[PDB]
Design a protein around this nucleic acid. Structure first.
Length: 233
RNA sequence: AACCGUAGGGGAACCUGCGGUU
RNA sequence: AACCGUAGGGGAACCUGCGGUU
């Protein structure tokens, strides 16, 4: 019964007069249907399928703009100055869409996704993390919206996915995001090794971080403290 | 930036060892 | 055998360093 669940997602977006809203990763149809019931301005569906895009021939309201490219490698700031990305995220490429969206932090203050409880709990921080989580929480706040049991989907799957809300909250200023990504990949590479091995000790000692500690024991402010030293000062 | 080659990261499909339940 | 847990095997997107070509 997607009826109920799809409404809750639009409700959470808070759509007003001058709102541009981009849907990512369709493949169902009814996603746009329920969104177009809200006071929109411009709506863009990003759908990978060349057959699904042709299903714009449902009602064909001239206030849409379906864009046939892929959501995981798209530049969002090409569209608008303040965007509200929404989308049910497929389990396989879910990571890439989130990485992709944060890159456009400047032109997207709010984003709401249907991911997967494990993928979501990882992103939150509380239950232990990966680099992608740190990348997100650097520029956004992840918020648990609601759980969805394996019945509200087309079939009943093996996972119980959850809805997440991402409100913009840049924690510390960062000039090059790719530079910053490369940094996190360098720290998270080979998780179980001591920090000292991965990064020059002269800088671990600089921060409050014990060099013989592990990358898991770190927490946001730790990641900031030493990055501000990495690109120098 | 794209694309070859190259070195890693990554971590889906599937495969198996052990344990719990039917 | 199936499902959950657990230890690996395996390695799809995709990212990155270096080199070449545009």
């Amino acid at each position: 019964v997607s009826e109920g669940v799809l409404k809750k997602i639009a409700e959470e977006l808070n759509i007003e007069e001058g709102n541009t809203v981009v849907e990512v990763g369709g493949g169902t149809g009814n996603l746009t249907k329920v969104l177009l019931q809200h006071p929109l301005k411009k709506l863009y569906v990003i759908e990978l399928d060349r057959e699904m895009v042709e299903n714009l021939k449902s009602i064909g309201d001239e206030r849409l703009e379906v864009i046939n490219e892929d959501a995981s490698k798209f530049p969002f700031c090409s569209l608008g100055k303040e965007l509200k990305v929404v989308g049910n995220l497929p389990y396989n490429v879910a990571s890439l869409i989130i990485e992709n969206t944060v890159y456009n932090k400047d032109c997207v203050p709010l984003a709401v996704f249907m991911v997967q409880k494990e993928v979501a709990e990882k992103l939150q921080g509380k239950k232990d993390t990966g680099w992608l989580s740190v990348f997100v929480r650097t520029f956004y706040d992840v918020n648990y919206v609601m759980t969805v049991p394996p019945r509200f989907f087309v079939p009943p799957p093996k996972v119980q996915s959850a809805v997440i809300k991402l409100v913009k909250n840049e924690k510390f200023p960062v000039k090059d995001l790719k530079n910053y990504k490369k940094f996190l990949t360098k720290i998270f590479q080979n998780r179980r090794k001591v920090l000292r091995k991965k990064i020059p000790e002269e800088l671990l000692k600089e921060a409050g971080i014990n060099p013989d500690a592990r990358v898991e024991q770190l927490s946001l402010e730790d990641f900031f403290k030493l990055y501000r030293l990495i690109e120098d000062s």
